Design an enzyme around this catalytic site. Structure first.
Site, PDB file in Angstrom:
ATOM      1  N   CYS A  81       0.822  -1.206   0.000  1.00 24.69           N
ATOM      2  CA  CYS A  81       0.000   0.000   0.000  1.00 24.69           C
ATOM      3  C   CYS A  81       0.854   1.254   0.000  1.00 24.69           C
ATOM      4  O   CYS A  81       1.890   1.303   0.666  1.00 24.69           O
ATOM      5  CB  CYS A  81      -0.924   0.032   1.216  1.00 24.69           C
ATOM      6  SG  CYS A  81      -2.109  -1.342   1.230  1.00 24.69           S
TER       7      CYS A  81
ATOM      8  N   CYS B 214      -3.726   0.533  -2.910  1.00 22.99           N
ATOM      9  CA  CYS B 214      -4.372   0.856  -1.625  1.00 22.99           C
ATOM     10  C   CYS B 214      -3.673   2.063  -1.032  1.00 22.99           C
ATOM     11  O   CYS B 214      -2.523   2.346  -1.352  1.00 22.99           O
ATOM     12  CB  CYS B 214      -4.372  -0.336  -0.635  1.00 22.99           C
ATOM     13  SG  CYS B 214      -2.885  -1.351  -0.657  1.00 22.99           S
TER      14      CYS B 214
END
Ligand SMILES: *[C@@H]1O[C@H](CO)[C@@H](O[C@@H]2O[C@H](CO)[C@@H](O)[C@H](O)[C@H]2NC(C)=O)[C@H](O)[C@H]1NC(C)=O
Ligand SMILES: *[C@@H]1O[C@H](CO)[C@@H](O[C@@H]2O[C@H](CO)[C@@H](O)[C@H](O)[C@H]2NC(C)=O)[C@H](O)[C@H]1NC(C)=O
Lengths: 237, 242
Positions: free
Chosen positions: A74, A155
């Site tokens: 992420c 993400c």
């Protein structure tokens, strides 16, 4: 074999893929478990060899993508459009990852490949061109499938590097515009950087028409958008 | 009788080719990664080519030159460990200290604990019997592999090297061991060598730095212009905690 309008396959394709796989898995980004590069190369070849090069489907790459999915931690993904050199230098410096920094992206970057029915060999004379021949060709389908998965797995905060020295920094028909942006998950936050050539005034900006189109896409995705502009290659890096 | 079971040594390790392959991937990607890349398919193919379908008692060092070229047993300066008669201790020490024995090089790692030999006119390993060094022939592919790997490992040593020897044997240095016959005599001149003679817990040592066998080693090292420091009267735990 020379019937297509695009350049033929990279002649040493097999050797190159396997060599890059060795470099990637051992030197650049060694993984938590070992991956067999011979088997990855074999899966890459099997996806397209001896098939009609204008009948490529996403499904053809299922096995290959499953062997090395293009996922990144992420907050570490970098997207780009029309800024190849800049985006990769930026990603290299900040320890971030573009699609070309994933295993399969690293293998394929800059290569061409296609087969011919009834043949176990690469067509080295010509390959389908996405415009003049067909969009359902093995090169285009690979990059779309890979881009889809790369985008889907983003993400937290993601960044896109766009070219502020073009009339339209955002091209709705680009792979970024068509495949990547539309596949970002809700709650991703996307930061765009519109970066211009050193010593030249920018030709596009965050208040331009092309960026309106991108914001439209992201609003429908529930993706938060923060757009920065008016900076040169030097300031960006 | 002149068939596959004619030799006195145990047969080739079953599924040798799978084991080599798996070990090479493990080594290059998870054990010693970050390093310059190595082509494991090519390494496996070269290993097999070196011995397959050849007279199993006519192995030569030169048969392994192409394999060694793909992955030389070179260890960074100051990180190299030699050992003789102390297999378990030496490898524990190397692990704890992030040093490398011969069995911690790529090729040493692939081959450690395995057996192999071929058969003329066959593309396969002989999994039934293989030549024994003493009863059949010294010039067999398993023995010759470790001999040439040992030579190249010794020749490429740099700066300080360490050897772990067995203080619980009457002679900690055996001139006819692989260490004494092949490694020590081929050490790169002007390295420095430290020997540690380690004895088993609660048993008084049977050899020491002042014994005859270490004198023989000293003589070899003097010949190589290699500085020698020898330390003894240490148990395993004392040695590991030095
Ligand atoms: C914006 O895109 C332009 C057009 O591709 C880039 O300019 C090219 O850059 C390449 C590689 O550096 C040069 O070899 C070409 O000669 C350039 N073409 C033109 C028309 O100038 C430019 O680098 C991009 N700018 C940014 C910031 O990414
Ligand atoms: C010194 O060498 C002796 C003899 O090989 C080692 O003792 C053997 O150790 C193995 C593995 O631990 C056992 O399976 C044998 O049963 C042992 N044999 C004897 C005679 O004890 C000993 O471990 C070595 N010591 C050091 C410090 O390396």
């Amino acid at each position: 074999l020379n019937r297509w309008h695009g350049a033929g396959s990279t002649a040493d394709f097999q050797k190159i893929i396997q060599e890059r796989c060795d470099t990637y898995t051992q030197t650049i980004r060694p993984g938590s478990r070992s991956r067999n590069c011979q088997a990855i190369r074999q899966a890459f070849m099997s996806a397209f060899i001896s098939k009609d090069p204008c009948k490529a489907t996403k499904e053809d790459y299922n096995s290959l993508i499953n062997l090395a999915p293009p996922t990144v931690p992420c907050g570490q993904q970098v997207f780009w459009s029309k800024t190849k050199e800049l985006a990769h230098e930026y990603a290299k410096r900040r320890r971030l990852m573009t699609l070309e920094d994933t295993l399969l992206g690293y293998l394929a970057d800059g290569l061409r490949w296609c087969g011919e029915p009834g043949s176990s060999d690469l067509n080295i004379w010509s390959c389908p061109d996405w415009r003049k021949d067909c969009r359902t060709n093995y090169l285009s389908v690979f990059w779309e499938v890979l881009s889809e998965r790369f985008a889907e797995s983003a993400c937290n905060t993601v960044r896109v590097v766009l070219n502020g020295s073009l009339e339209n920094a955002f091209d709705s028909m680009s792979i970024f515009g068509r495949v990547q942006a539309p596949n970002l998950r809700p709650q991703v936050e996307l930061e765009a950087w519109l970066v211009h050539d050193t010593g030249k005034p920018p030709s596009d900006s965050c208040s331009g028409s092309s960026i309106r189109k991108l914001k439209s896409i992201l609003d429908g995705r529930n993706v938060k958008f923060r757009c920065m502009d008016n900076l040169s290659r030097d300031q960006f890096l």
